Write a protein that binds this DNA or RNA. Structure first.
Lengths: 458, 182, 273, 461, 59, 166
RNA sequence: UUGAACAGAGAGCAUUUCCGGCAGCAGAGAUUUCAGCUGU
């Protein structure tokens, strides 16, 4: 009943800053008993969890972890993971924006010149290779490998599984950043115009057009927790947006200069933003505190990414550098680059790699595996990062081994339980409650000159 | 996407992944499958022209019917749209909203007049021939299918000489002269 | 899914089995992933009684390892907590599930009965009675189950009344195999021999005869003759009197050969008259 | 340097043999499953919409009805599918509700058959054959109570003189009848309420409070020796058969059309009366109703309890029936039909799943108590989905978007217009009593549950 | 419109009412046993047999 | 309540135990009428508790004639006395569902504590187990049921017509 | 409606009546488990 890992499974509630009703008293007592039983029994599943997370540990004081080479990892790990660590050398079209499907089964690469390829990177099956000879910028899958949206010269296009064009969106005028919201079925679009557009993929209907009013959108990320969009502008300002409010939900002053990249944890708690002022900044999202401010990077961080197990992958051109346990509150988790004299209270890099020829275009962790796919000027490279993936997925949220029938039925079922775009709030648990107006107690309709003293009476 | 069940047809009806409201019935896709347009955005760079001529025909309708600036510019526009062959006659200015079509401004393209005067036998083979570089309007070769013609140049659409399909039709009719090198 | 239900029914015993400091978390995760494999193979499609048998063998092996580790770590022979009966209860439930799914392999039914009998004082003889009742309901014609049921309830419990009831019900169901007749006359001779030997013993310390065996001998001859004349010449009596007398002679040969075997294994009961 | 990556191994996740299903590993992290309020809000909304499209409650009418409108119905409390109905032209019929067809019809009387019930007649000379004969008895305004037997094909044990085994006789007319659930006894109300048993041809006892007639009668179902009756002086009288006497009566404002006792609580009953609502009364304290079920718009003609005791059905003179949860006090459901006129009798079948209504055009109709509920047997996946959806609609019940959908029905034009003028009338009288209370000194706050009792014999202390 | 207008009847304040709503009963968020305990209804009848009135041990 | 079910068939006798009652009032409805066609829901109603197979084609023909003319044979007596609980004869008999309204009297003549039902509910329960057949029996019979049906039909017909091969 | 003896079912409910403690010893089945006496 005690369960040393309950507070992961606990659930916050409302507080005022007991009752005389017998029936209501016993009803609330049954509700508290059921909540305790449910938390305990849900937290006892960690026995049933099949796999264990990966790691790499130094076992010596001369053996630092950032100086461990990718060939040495590929020798030290098994043949299946060594074959997952792919490398495509696609030289002639531009730097390749990488994208993985939400289970790690499909890869979607876009060249800057025109070359968009959707493929099953772990078999050898490509299912779309289309050369759209205008400058493409980004792409994403929608709810499947079966549809993907590409952001072209101006218009965003939507292609089916084999690459036939389904849609040319006449809105979404100049996208540079696309991201799909999978529980809400919303393709979110931002770019050189100062506008943020939410487009419902299922109905086909443009849900929202929002003026950023801050020029072109330099970075864009999605909170996986509550589906609000963090856009980074040329002010050094991140703004958190929802498709209901025509104003940003929050505006944070992250950096000086512009904001080069944003990444959010999948728990929706931490956000790493890199500015062009050579400054990485780790942010608390829920309480909006600034946790860490790594200033004076040697060159501006062009990308950040956060794995499912909380690694932090920063990329500064040729270099990729990953820190472990950097998204924590304490000042001993501030990511350093060296430990001055061997200080154990300095978060040196967990591992680093140098793409010596080129400058990396973007970063993306492969979802349920221990790999980091970085797309760069001459194609794709996966890196075996051992701490970097949820070993125990849930197979009824999203399954890496899913079949054709399972894809069909899961598509219909998630389409059926698509969440409305109005339910996107800054916290997800605020659509069962009562208003923050409409008084917290329910109402019971019962509650619904001594002369002048004489001259008074006149 | 799954040919949904009945409680399914009822629960969500406006869902349609294939055809949205702003597709306008996919008329761009339909007319470029008809007249076989190579790249995208040709439809909309014709539709901007259609919208511009109906907008300035609207504001020429706005101006009073007596001034020579208005009447000279509407007869000039009508004669230029006759001279590029978008129309077939010099009729009413009501035809500048009834008869100007993105279809007809595709009818003046070079492969479709080629199929019209039976130089090719289908518009696809016409685009085959003019990407292979066989035809010319007057002196100069035509490489792209986006060159639409005017009303004067439907008479000098001819192949080049040394075009071997011209040589095959000459030796079909065995009028094949070879002093003229084709 | 129901594999999820069974797998999370398995968790309190390993709660207790980690608290009693004999197993660790990394090895109990290994026994849970093996048990996950087995539960999924059990309640998925295309299932096999060999999947059931291998699950029972795995659960008995982890029970023996648990007992060995308990004696080596805690130096007690049972912790008197949940984790010393839960796994035998699991084996009994795997047996019950398997016999409900494939009630056709008497090898598995008899492995169930053997494990349930050999469980010892912890089981209940009415729990053995229940699975004897449903097994005899499903296989009334298979006669070795009747012999085994009556043999368990006489040669272990010495319940003469219930043993007589079992033999009379079996002879009601299949009064055609002579083996059940011979085991009934064997049981009645054993019962009357134990009766007269307890008489001799009470005499030496301090009416009801083999006529029961003779009467069941008489009805054995009569009904075995009736069932052989009904079994052979099967459909109709379309046979002339040569074939009828040939048949009746052969049934006399059959029945008299069985009575020859009756006297041949009747002589060795030499403690009664 | 030690090193370990994720080894997925493909034997645990995609099965070896093709005949068996794939493994579904779970991981109960809320990080893995993010939108836990919105996702089950949308499942509760899709459950309410699925209920509003699956609500097909009309099963079927049974037989061809009667000729002159059904004024009496009685289920038998031991068999599931048998039903006796009588009309205004004196014909009674016994029904098999499985095949929806009459076992037998009977020209029983000449007037209206004003009551009928069913019996297991404890004769002490004969033995009742209840496996092949059913027994219904029935009183009319031609001063007769007649007892009939029915040949029933439900067991195939046997292989016969069906109708009218005896004829009780009164001097004045009868108006209601109900049978005791043991000991050969019944009671008939009329010009005066008499008790009878099936052996004697005359009333055992006359149990009348005063010289005011009795319009309806119900025996209790447990504590079977407690009777209740409705008299046309707007009176509800309780009788006890140990003391062989009346017990206590109350006088209300308007006339109680019917009673039914709670089969699970044994001292609670529900009255159905002429101001358009029903009253849930405790026998041990009749000074206050313990519920009022309000949503009807004309006089409530008949009420009945679910055999689970948890909900009531209530048919009224506006041509519609209404089902009420017992703890709420407003209608959970309304059933209407353009063909159904003036529902005079409603019973709740012993399955607790179907509702029998007898209208006055002639027809007796079956309905589902839960409209969206089908009667097949269910695999565990669909049974789990259905009770998950019930719990989810329950805990999101009061959200405005799903409340406006679950609250929605199509009511006829006449009932809708009567409902809205009833609303503006009630709002006007609340406005005027608020003004009068603002001025005057001592205006007592009378409860709604007491606002309909004009008085009570044997006062409470 | 995704949050209720006032506090519904059986509760007295929104702390009580949101303590009712604080745990999801879904398959994805509870174990299988807890999911079954949370979704079994209060009234469970048998689907084809008669329900008799209650009888008590001597009232 | 339809508690037990007796299905006669050429391989022997089967006693099933009714788990869930089907609906009585909604017995003519569409879902109730096609749940006996779906096997995944019929196995929620019917469970096999016993199957006594015959001793051969001779006892098969004897029991086919006894079932045909509505009599309880000795194998019927054995399997019913094994399977049905010793209920009372005056209060709440055990309920057996048969398909033959003139075999019922022969069953109550031998077991007075058994009331027998063959109305439309027992009829469609019986035709559910006829429709599914070999799937309900879980593998426990020798001999294919249709092959025994061919043999028993030919034997019954030649007996009824007195077919002589002389 | 009760009482009596008889035949039972495994389908319910208590509670300190004993056992799931240790040997010595013979017995049981295939070197492991199984079955009772004298005291802790």
């Amino acid at each position: 009943k005690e369960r040393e890992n309950q507070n992961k499974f606990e659930r916050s509630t409302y507080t005022n800053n007991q009752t005389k009703d017998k029936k209501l008293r016993a009803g609330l007592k049954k509700i508290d008993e059921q909540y305790k039983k449910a938390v305990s029994s849900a937290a006892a599943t960690d026995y049933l969890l099949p796999e264990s997370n990966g790691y790499l540990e130094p076992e010596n004081e001369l053996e630092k972890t950032f100086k461990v080479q990718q060939s040495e990892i590929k020798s030290s790990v098994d043949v299946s993971t060594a074959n997952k660590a792919l490398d495509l050398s696609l030289k002639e079209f531009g730097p390749y924006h990488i994208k993985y499907a939400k289970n790690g089964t499909h890869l979607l690469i876009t060249g800057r010149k025109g070359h968009v390829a959707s493929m099953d990177w772990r078999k050898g099956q490509l299912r779309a290779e289309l050369f759209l000879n205008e400058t493409c910028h980004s792409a994403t899958y929608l709810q499947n490998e079966q549809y993907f949206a590409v952001a072209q010269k101006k218009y965003t296009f939507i292609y089916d599984h084999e690459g036939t064009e389904l849609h040319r969106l006449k809105q979404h005028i100049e996208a540079r950043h696309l991201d799909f919201l999978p529980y809400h079925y919303l393709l979110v679009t931002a770019g050189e115009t100062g506008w943020l557009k939410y487009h419902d993929v299922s109905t086909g209907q443009l849900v929202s057009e929002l003026r950023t009013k801050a020029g072109p959108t330099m970075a864009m990320a999605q909170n996986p927790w509550n589906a609000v969009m963090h856009l980074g502008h040329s002010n050094g300002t991140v703004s958190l947006w929802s498709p209901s409010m025509p104003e940003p939900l929050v505006k944070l002053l992250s950096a000086r200069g512009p904001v080069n990249s944003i990444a959010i944890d999948r728990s929706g708690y931490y956000m790493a933003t890199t500015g062009a002022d050579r400054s990485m900044k780790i942010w608390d999202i829920r309480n909006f505190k600034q946790l860490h401010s790594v200033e004076s990077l040697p060159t501006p961080g062009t990308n950040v990414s956060i794995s499912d197990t909380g690694l932090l992958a920063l990329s500064r051109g040729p270099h990729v550098t990953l820190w472990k346990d950097a998204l924590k509150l304490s000042g001993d988790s501030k990511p350093c680059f060296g430990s001055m004299g061997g200080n154990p209270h300095r978060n040196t890099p967990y591992m680093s790699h140098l793409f010596a020829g080129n400058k990396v275009e973007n970063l993306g962790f492969v979802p349920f595996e221990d790999l980091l796919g970085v797309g760069h000027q001459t194609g794709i490279t996966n890196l075996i990062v051992p701490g970097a993936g949820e070993a125990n997925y849930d197979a009824l949220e999203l399954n890496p081994f899913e079949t054709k029938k399972q894809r069909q039925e899961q598509e219909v079922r998630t389409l059926l339980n698509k969440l409305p775009a109005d339910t996107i709030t800054l916290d997800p648990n605020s659509i069962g409650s009562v208003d923050k107006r409409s008084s917290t107690i329910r109402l019971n309709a019962k509650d619904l000159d001594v002369i002048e003293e004489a001259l008074s009476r006149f | 996407v799954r040919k949904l069940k009945h409680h399914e047809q009822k629960l969500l009806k406006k869902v349609d992944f294939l055809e949205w409201k702003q597709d306008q019935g996919h008329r761009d896709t339909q007319v470029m499958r008809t007249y076989h347009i190579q790249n995208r955005e040709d439809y909309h760079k014709y539709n901007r022209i259609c919208g511009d001529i109906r907008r300035l025909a609207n504001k020429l309708s706005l101006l009073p019917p007596t001034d020579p600036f208005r009447r000279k510019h509407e007869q000039l526009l009508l004669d230029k749209l006759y001279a590029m062959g978008v129309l077939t006659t010099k009729s009413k200015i009501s035809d500048l909203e009834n008869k100007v079509t993105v279809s007809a401004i595709c009818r003046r393209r070079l492969p479709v007049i080629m199929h019209r005067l039976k130089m090719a036998e289908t518009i696809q083979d016409a685009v085959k021939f003019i990407e292979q570089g066989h035809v010319r309007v007057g002196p100069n070769l035509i490489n792209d299918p986006a060159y639409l013609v005017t009303r004067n140049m439907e008479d000098y659409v001819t192949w080049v000489d040394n075009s071997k399909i011209k040589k095959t039709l000459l030796r079909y009719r065995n009028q094949i002269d070879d002093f003229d090198f084709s | 899914s129901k594999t999820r239900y069974y797998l999370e029914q398995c968790i309190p015993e390993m709660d207790d089995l980690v608290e009693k400091g004999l197993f660790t978390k990394n090895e109990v995760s290994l026994i849970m992933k093996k048990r996950t494999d087995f539960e999924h193979r059990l309640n998925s499609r295309g299932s096999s009684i060999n999947d059931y048998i291998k699950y029972i063998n795995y659960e008995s092996n982890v029970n023996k390892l648990r007992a060995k580790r308990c004696k080596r770590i805690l130096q007690v022979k049972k912790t008197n907590s949940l984790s010393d009966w839960s796994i035998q209860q699991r084996i009994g439930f795997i047996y019950q599930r398997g016999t409900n799914k494939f009630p056709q392999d008497l090898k598995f039914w008899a492995m169930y009965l053997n494990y349930m009998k050999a469980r010892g004082n912890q089981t209940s003889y009415k729990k053995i009675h229940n699975i004897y009742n449903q097994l005899l309901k499903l296989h009334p014609t298979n006669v070795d189950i009747w012999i085994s049921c009556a043999k368990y309830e006489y040669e272990v419990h010495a319940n003469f009344k219930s043993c007589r009831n079992i033999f009379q019900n079996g002879l009601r169901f299949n009064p055609d195999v002579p083996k059940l007749w011979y085991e009934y006359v064997k049981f009645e001779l054993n019962f009357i021999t134990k009766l007269i030997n307890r008489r001799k013993v009470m005499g030496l310390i301090n009416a009801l005869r083999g006529d029961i065996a003779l009467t069941i001998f008489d009805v054995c001859m009569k009904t075995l003759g009736k069932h052989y004349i009904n079994k052979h010449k099967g459909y109709y009596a379309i046979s002339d009197s040569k074939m009828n007398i040939e048949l009746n002679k052969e049934t006399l040969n059959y029945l008299f050969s069985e009575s020859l075997r009756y006297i041949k294994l009747f002589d060795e009961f030499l403690d009664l008259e | 340097m030690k090193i370990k990556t994720i080894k997925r191994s493909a034997d645990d996740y995609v099965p070896v043999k093709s005949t068996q299903e794939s493994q579904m590993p779970r991981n109960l992290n809320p990080e893995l499953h993010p939108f836990e309020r919105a996702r089950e809000y949308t499942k509760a909304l899709n459950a309410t919409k699925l209920e509003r499209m699956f609500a097909k409650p009309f099963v079927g009418q049974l037989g061809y009805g009667h000729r002159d409108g059904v004024y009496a119905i009685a289920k038998n409390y031991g068999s599931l599918n048998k039903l006796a109905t009588g009309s205004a032209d004196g014909v009674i019929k016994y029904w098999n509700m499985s095949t929806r067809e009459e076992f037998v019809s009977f020209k029983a009387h000449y007037g209206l058959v004003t009551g009928l019930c069913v019996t297991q007649p404890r004769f002490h000379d004969k033995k009742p054959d209840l496996k092949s004969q059913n027994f219904m008895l029935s009183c009319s305004d031609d001063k007769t109570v007649k007892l009939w037997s029915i040949n029933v094909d439900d067991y195939s044990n046997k292989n016969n003189e069906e109708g009218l085994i005896r004829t009780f006789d009164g001097e004045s007319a009868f108006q209601g009848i109900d049978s005791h659930r043991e000991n050969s006894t019944f009671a008939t109300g009329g010009a005066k309420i008499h008790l009878w048993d099936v052996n004697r041809l005359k009333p055992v006892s006359d149990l009348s409070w005063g010289a005011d007639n009795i319009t309806s009668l119900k025996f209790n179902q447990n504590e079977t020796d407690i009777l209740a009756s409705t008299g046309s002086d707007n009176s509800i009288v309780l009788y006890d058969l140990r003391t062989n006497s009346p017990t206590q009566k109350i006088v209300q404002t308007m006339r109680t059309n019917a009673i039914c006792w709670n089969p699970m609580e044994a001292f609670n009953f529900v009255t159905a009366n002429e101001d358009h609502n029903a009253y849930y009364y405790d026998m041990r304290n009749l000074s206050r109703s313990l519920n009022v079920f309000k949503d009807h718009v004309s006089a409530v003609m008949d009420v009945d309890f679910s055999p689970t005791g948890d909900e009531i059905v209530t048919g009224s003179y506006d041509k519609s029936i209404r089902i009420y949860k017992t703890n709420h006090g407003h209608s959970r459901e309304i059933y209407h039909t353009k063909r159904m006129q003036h529902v005079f009798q409603v019973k709740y079948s012993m399955d607790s799943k179907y509702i029998i209504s007898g209208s006055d055009d002639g027809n007796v109709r079956l309905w589902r108590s839960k409209a969206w509920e089908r009667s097949n047997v269910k695999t565990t996946r669909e049974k789990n989905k259905l009770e998950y959806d019930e719990k989810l609609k329950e805990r999101f019940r009061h959200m405005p978007e799903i409340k406006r959908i679950s609250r929605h029905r199509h009511v006829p034009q006449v009932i809708k217009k009567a409902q809205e003028i009833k609303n503006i009338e009630l709002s006007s009288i609340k406005r005027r009593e608020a003004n009068e209370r603002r001025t005057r000194k001592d205006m007592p706050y009378i409860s709604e549950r007491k606002k309909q009792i004009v008085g009570t014999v044997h006062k409470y202390e | 419109k995704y949050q209720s207008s006032a506090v519904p009847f059986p509760f007295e304040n929104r702390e009580q009412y949101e303590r009712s709503l604080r745990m999801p009963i879904g398959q994805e968020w509870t174990s299988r046993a807890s999911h079954q305990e949370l979704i079994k209804p209060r009234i469970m009848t048998k689907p084809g047999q008669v329900i008799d009135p209650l009888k008590a041990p001597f009232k | 309540p339809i508690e037990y079910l007796l299905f006669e068939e050429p391989t022997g006798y089967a006693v099933f135990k009714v788990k869930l009652q089907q609906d009585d009032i909604g017995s003519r409805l569409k879902e109730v009428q096609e749940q006996i066609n779906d096997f995944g829901a019929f196995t929620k109603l019917i469970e096999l508790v016993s199957f006594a197979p015959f001793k051969g084609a001779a006892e098969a023909l004897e029991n086919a004639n006894d079932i045909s003319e509505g009599l309880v044979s000795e194998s019927l007596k054995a399997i019913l006395d094994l399977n049905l609980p010793k209920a009372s004869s005056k209060k709440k008999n055990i309920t057996l569902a048969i398909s033959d309204k003139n075999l019922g009297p022969s069953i109550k003549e031998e077991f007075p504590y058994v009331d027998c039902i063959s109305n439309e509910l027992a009829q469609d329960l019986i035709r559910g187990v006829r429709l599914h057949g070999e799937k309900l029996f879980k593998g426990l019979q020798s001999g294919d049921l249709e092959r025994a049906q061919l043999g028993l039909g030919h034997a019954y017909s030649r007996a009824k017509v007195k077919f002589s091969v002389q």
